[PDB]
Write a protein that binds this ligand. Structure first.
Ligand SMILES: Cc1c(N2C[C@@H]3CCCN[C@@H]3C2)c(F)cc2c(=O)c(C(=O)O)cn(C3CC3)c12
Ligand SMILES: Cc1c(N2C[C@@H]3CCCN[C@@H]3C2)c(F)cc2c(=O)c(C(=O)O)cn(C3CC3)c12
Ligand SMILES: [Mg+2]
Ligand SMILES: [Mg+2]
Ligand SMILES: [Mg+2]
Ligand SMILES: [Mg+2]
Lengths: 487, 247, 487, 245
DNA sequence: ACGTGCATAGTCATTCATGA
DNA sequence: TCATGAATGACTATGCACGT
């Protein structure tokens, strides 16, 4: 039996825990803004074909696929992660198209796995766009059976768009969501002004990203906290719901709350007001009624007493309830396997760097494949030019190897090309098909020229990111939800 | 007559309505937590209350009374309806003048319906006699036309009809997404439930009527009673002709 | 609002429940001895490729696949059914190869879905043997997206082998498991004596099927109950565990129980004795100690007092515990969609009928496919004889449609055959390759003649069932576990 | 000698031996693993106490709240000894306390939480060498003809694979080397032949050298002061690999 | 009254960091 | 003390028929 000192054991084990949690659980990768479970769920659904071009698969199949191949953990918590990515009040830009009961902003829990179906959203398809073209590094999974992606292509800035919140060890992250169109403008500037230093870039990006854009709409009061977050990586952003005072024909006035700040439970909010009333904490309130429905959305009516001023009661609500509540921003993300608090300019830049990497790698892959097909096509054309000879040769061969060996000798061909000639069907010996082979060679050589041009010119590379992103934003971009007001 | 609704002595599972008038109030007794959750969201909280029932309801015909009263789900129903049971029944204290039973269209939903109807007929019969008990018919299909509004069908025949009519009208459907088939209430969201089973302007309700009480009594005792042989012979005798009851 | 009478509603709804539960939930199909959940799990695993020729897949993937395609019910109970089919103390011949903690014969529950892996067993592969050759009717699943099997090929009598227990409405089934080798002999006799009446057949089959063979070994006392079950479809079979009296150095005696009757919980059994001793119902017992382990199996040591007779205590155990307990046989199974209590000869006969159906359908499928291949091959041979013309024709054709239409006219060929000529690779124009087409035609025509011969001869059909089953039994048959003794 | 249950935790699968000196308590992570352990154990000398979920941090949590925790009560009650000043090693019901967690990171975390409980409430158990750590297997090499081999590290896996292939043995490239991602994936037999069979199990005895140095380390890593822990990790995680070089 | 097996998921307690 | 969000599932109750 080997002896081990408690200090050695404690230090090693806990550090191992802190590090795995930090890098591989609780905190997002800066490039795609995803935690491991998110990335693995999405890729599992993707590889399974659970895409918008087909009907919703039972969500259990997504959980099981994620569990069985990539994520060596429990089915329950994986389902929770999949579910959250489908809630429009959780994600600013949902990555999962949920079918069925996925819960509500209140205490109504999501239906069990058995009752729900799920597939990837169109935007999530942009997260995975051209992932099969060697655009990202793959590694063996938890048992070496299959490969999984280290990071997704992420053809839109998902970290900033959807934000991220995570509790790790020794640190935690809390990045708010943002408006995709505003982020795109920041990216577009970063691409145009690719040589700009950090000071200029921060100034430019902060001008275009006006502030967080929460899925729950609401209000942002002030500008200091937002500025602090972008310049420091830490900032306190004051959020408010929306209140509309209504007057009765001949009764009392009432406050109608139609929006709440980000991550405020509707039921807890109502309960908090109700409990602070009977305890004499919010006098002036006469009655609390939840007139909310699936058709009118959030609608909490707070009838106030006649000897009470509406503005006084609202300020009391701001003070003693989450009608006014702060978002504690802490812009923490994993950069190159290291946890780092980032300025807004750093977040954009790192993303732009990732996009350029993706496009260059994609181009390299396509160029290699283009060369391979061209290589084979060159062989086919040689066969067509001497078609009479090709057939006669193959006929006299005892095997296919003698026939192939001859083809090399006849037309000066590789083994790959000769094999391709051998695999050729009589289908393609028709006139138009022979011409199609010719034109196809001409097409690829043209594509190769284009591809070569891209690799040699950083200008085009940045242009590709711009144009492709612009296309995504035009299609999937939406209006701002959270309104920004002054003090 | 008016009675207080719970708002922050009634079942915890009950999502009560706001209206204090039973004559205008409705209780949706729902199968499952999932369906009950969506119903709680899609309902009209003014007049419609939700009481989700979890698992198969206890057979009051077989189990002795003391055991039935200890059952959490039965207690929820009795407490929510406000009325007593048996001799202590008082319809004046009825908290909802519409008691809608909403179960899955599947076979197990039918079973739960018979168990609930057995509870009502044995403990609170006047609710049936005075037409306070209803049956909600859930949709079976949702036709998702590419450009037009989606249509719901409550039978295979109606699905075929709406499909034919729409196609004849020049509308088109994806052969992938296409016609969503519901296998239970739990698969529906809040909106879907409203537009098919809870919106009073489109919902398909069936009112349970009681004609021959003596004949009802014997049928209940045969189907739900402790006597297996009687039930076995009844099924083998009448299952052959179940299709032809309404022909 | 439509009115409906309570009597109509009650009758209609309950009958609908009773019938589906009877035919489509609780009771086994006589042909494969499977309930719907069993059949759907096995086919799901099969179609997923979760077979013994590959590593165990995570059991969650099997549950999810079963849920998403075939079985519209909860994941939990589906997992329970999968687990049971993997327990050697539940199934006499397990259909699922489980990897991990699948519980014990006691109160130790199986591990959660996340912790276990599972695949089909070799015998389960015989349940599904050649299911893809139209050997069984398929129907659309619960939403019509895909097809599922109505019944499995079941190339060994699974109903009798593994037995079945189920609670339906108005009725219940309780068929015990049997020894595969004994069942095989019964099947072999039924095949040889295909004209024997029910009277003779019952006598023969009862001679070969000596009685139920439980996975938990133990003892069968008497022969009447077994006879009743086989002749009536109902009988009470007395089971016993195995007790071995041990003496001590002091001279104290102890009873060692190493086996228990079928479906007796080990922990409940120990607890029952413990409770029957403290109350004062099994005097003579001094101490109860469970010396069981994974290495020695069941081993319950019952130390008895010095003033106690071993057999007296054993007889008391037989009387007051499940050390001796009866199996209530009720041979109920679904036959052609109808619940029926069956004699043993009927069970064998109905299975043999199913096997013959499988073999004839398989042969028909193979015969149809063989003709299709022959049909196309004949087309190719015609092309080879006029190869110079065929190629010249395709080349001189402006399109492939012109070429195809021409080929039809040139060689007097179908469009399917003509299409095959077009699809032909330049490989197949080599000398030896031309020869294989000729020989393959000759090869298939021999196969077609053989297949036709099988369909024309009931003798061969029965012979195939016999030989194929014999092969299965030789490989997967095992010794008897339950010992049969007289009064 | 002390009585075994046949006034202790319901989750406890106690041993049969009446002698604490001969008895062992396997504190196991998870119900699944605990279930399999209960079957694969030697019921004579080995008892099983499955622990469910992350153990409460006694460094952070208030004393009264720790005592309300069902899992902590199970441990304290099963060990028989008191806690803090009321600790009495004489009442120790098992002279071997084996902590058995998954080889994964959350198992490492649970180990630190358990070691924190022991060091703060029942330190003498550590000082007198009654606390041990079981090392679960990581791989199971399934040779086509030969008996299966277990490996407790990537290096050993590579070695045993090399040796076997050199010896003429062969493995399927499908089934092949089964990799354990936790105790819950193992059955009774596997657990016995790797972590519970005393003739092959790899146990590590926890020793306590400098009590004062241990005290501050526990307080840094497990305490409420985040800053101290954050800086400690950023300071020492860089060199965690080289602690035993 | 208990076992059987296929059907009809929410609740329960911790780690971890931060701000109310 | 509470919320956040990915990590570490056993227990709880009915239907249904049948035999001790
Ligand atoms: C054990 C466990 C829980 N229990 C642990 C506690 C100690 C013992 C008494 N039971 C309480 C509650 C729980 F409340 C939730 C979950 C989960 O939500 C869950 C999940 O997968 O989400 C998994 N587990 C188990 C693996 C540990 C959970
Ligand atoms: C409700 C339910 C159970 N209980 C019945 C009671 C209903 C009212 C109050 N809650 C308890 C909880 C249960 F003990 C097990 C299961 C299951 O095993 C199970 C399963 O899927 O196996 C599904 N359910 C629920 C759908 C009904 C179960
Ligand atoms: Mg959970
Ligand atoms: Mg249902
Ligand atoms: Mg269950
Ligand atoms: Mg683990």
């Amino acid at each position: 039996i080997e002896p081990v000192d408690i200090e050695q054991e404690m230090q090693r084990s806990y550090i191992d825990y802190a590090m795995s949690v930090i890098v591989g659980r609780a905190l997002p990768e800066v490039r795609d803004g995803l935690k491991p479970v998110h990335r693995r769920v999405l890729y599992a659904m993707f590889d399974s074909g659970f895409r918008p071009d087909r009907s919703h698969a039972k969500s259990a199949r997504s959980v099981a696929e994620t569990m069985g191949n990539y994520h060596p953990h429990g089915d329950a918590s994986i389902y929770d992660s999949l579910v959250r990515m489908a809630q429009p009040w959780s994600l600013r830009y949902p990555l999962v198209d949920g079918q069925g009961n996925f819960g509500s902003p209140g205490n109504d829990p999501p239906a069990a796995m058995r009752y729900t179906e799920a597939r990837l959203t169109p935007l999530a398809m942009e997260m995975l766009r051209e992932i099969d073209e060697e655009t990202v590094d793959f590694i063996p999974n938890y048992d070496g059976r299959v490969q999984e992606p280290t990071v997704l292509p992420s053809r839109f800035p998902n970290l900033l768009a959807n934000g991220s919140g995570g509790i790790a060890v020794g640190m935690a992250t809390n990045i708010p969501p943002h408006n995709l169109r505003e982020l795109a403008d920041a990216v577009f500037w970063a691409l145009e002004n690719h040589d700009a230093d950090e000071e200029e870039t921060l100034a430019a990006v902060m001008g275009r990203v006006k502030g967080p854009d929460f899925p729950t709409a609401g209000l942002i009061v002030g500008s200091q906290g937002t500025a602090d977050a972008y310049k420091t990586g830490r900032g306190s952003i004051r959020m408010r719901g929306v209140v509309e005072v209504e007057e009765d024909s001949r009764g009392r006035t009432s406050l109608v709350i139609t929006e709440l700040p980000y991550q405020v439970n509707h039921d807890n909010f109502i309960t908090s007001i109700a409990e602070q009333v009977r305890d004499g904490k919010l006098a002036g309130i006469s009655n609390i009624e939840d007139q909310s429905s699936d058709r009118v959305g959030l609608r909490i009516v707070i009838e106030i007493k006649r000897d009470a001023v509406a503005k006084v009661v609202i300020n009391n609500l701001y003070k003693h309830t989450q009608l006014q509540t702060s978002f504690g921003a802490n812009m923490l993300a994993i950069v190159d396997g290291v946890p780092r608090t980032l300025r807004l300019d750093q977040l954009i830049r790192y993303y732009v760097d990732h996009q350029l990497d993706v496009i260059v790698r994609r181009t390299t892959y396509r160029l290699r494949k283009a060369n391979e097909r061209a290589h084979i096509l060159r062989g086919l054309v040689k066969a067509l030019d001497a078609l009479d000879e090709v057939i006669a040769l193959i006929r006299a061969s005892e095997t296919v190897d003698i026939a192939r060996a001859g083809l090399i000798e006849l037309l000066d061909i590789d083994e790959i090309q000769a094999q391709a000639i051998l695999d050729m069907q009589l289908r393609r010996l028709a006139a138009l098909e022979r011409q199609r082979i010719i034109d196809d060679l001409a097409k690829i050589e043209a594509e190769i020229a284009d591809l070569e041009d891209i690799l040699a010119k950083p200008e085009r590379q940045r242009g590709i990111v711009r144009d492709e992103l612009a296309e995504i934003v035009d299609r999937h971009g939406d209006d701002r939800r959270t309104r920004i007001i002054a003090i | 007559n008016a009675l207080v609704r719970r708002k922050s002595g009634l079942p915890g599972k009950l999502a009560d309505c706001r209206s204090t008038d039973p004559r205008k109030s409705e209780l949706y007794v729902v199968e499952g937590d999932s369906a009950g959750g969506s119903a709680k969201s899609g309902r009209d909280s003014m007049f419609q209350a939700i009481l989700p029932l979890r698992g198969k309801i206890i057979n009051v015909e077989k189990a002795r009374i003391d055991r039935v009263l200890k059952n959490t789900e039965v207690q929820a129903i009795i407490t929510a309806l406000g009325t007593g049971i048996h001799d202590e029944f008082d319809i004046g204290k009825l908290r909802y003048h519409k008691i809608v039973l909403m179960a899955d269209a599947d076979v197990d939903g039918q079973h739960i319906s018979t168990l609930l109807l057995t509870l009502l007929f044995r403990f609170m019969r006047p609710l049936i006699e005075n037409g306070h008990v209803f049956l909600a018919q859930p949709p079976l299909y949702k036709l998702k036309w590419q450009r037009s509004d989606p249509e719901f069908a409550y039978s295979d025949r109606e699905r075929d009809g709406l499909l034919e009519a729409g196609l004849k009208a020049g509308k088109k459907i994806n052969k992938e997404d296409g016609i969503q088939r519901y296998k239970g209430l739990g698969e529906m969201d809040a909106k879907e439930l409203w537009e098919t089973t809870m919106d009073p302007s489109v919902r398909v309700l069936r009112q349970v009527t009681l004609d021959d009480a003596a004949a009802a009594d014997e049928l209940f005792s045969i189907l739900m009673g402790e006597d297996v042989d009687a039930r076995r012979s009844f099924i083998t005798r009448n299952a052959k002709d179940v299709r032809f009851l309404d022909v």
